[PDB]
Design a protein around this ligand. Structure first.
Ligand SMILES: *[C@@H]1O[C@H](CO)[C@@H](O[C@@H]2O[C@H](CO)[C@@H](O[C@@H]3O[C@H](CO)[C@@H](O)[C@H](O)[C@@H]3O)[C@H](O)[C@H]2NC(C)=O)[C@H](O)[C@H]1NC(C)=O
Lengths: 49, 49
């Protein structure tokens, strides 16, 4: 994501590689949301424990 | 002494035939939000030490 801005700011990119990792992005964003806590805090494993 | 009133008088043939709707002081009371405040709510968890 900090790289995404590097592709954006330095201007070396394309909508495809853009779109490529957008697919990556939403996943791990969501995969993380299985790892955190109900207090809003986040853990390494968390849920199922 | 400086008040304003609600004044119903009805035949008790409609009303023997079917009651009115749940009117008393209790009605007001159990219409209320958070009769008790017991336990914090959910979203707030605690304060640790
Ligand atoms: C990442 O992507 C953006 C998307 O284009 C890059 O372009 C920047 O886009 C913003 C949009 O707000 C530009 O702002 C512009 O301001 C002028 C003047 O008020 C207005 O007429 C335009 O409609 C637009 O709102 C901005 O100029 C443009 N680049 C910049 C910020 O210099 C942006 O470069 C990249 N930066 C980010 C968003 O991290």
């Amino acid at each position: 994501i900090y790289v995404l801005d590097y592709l954006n700011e330095t201007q070396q990119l394309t909508p495809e590689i853009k779109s490529k990792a957008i697919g990556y992005l939403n996943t791990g964003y969501q995969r993380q949301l299985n790892y955190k806590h109900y207090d809003g805090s986040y853990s390494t494993f968390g849920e199922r424990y | 002494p400086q008040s304003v009133c609600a004044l119903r008088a009805v035949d008790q043939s409609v009303l023997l035939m079917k009651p009115d709707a749940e009117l008393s002081a209790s009605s007001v009371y159990n219409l209320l939000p958070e009769k008790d405040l017991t336990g914090f709510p959910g979203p707030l968890n605690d304060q640790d030490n």
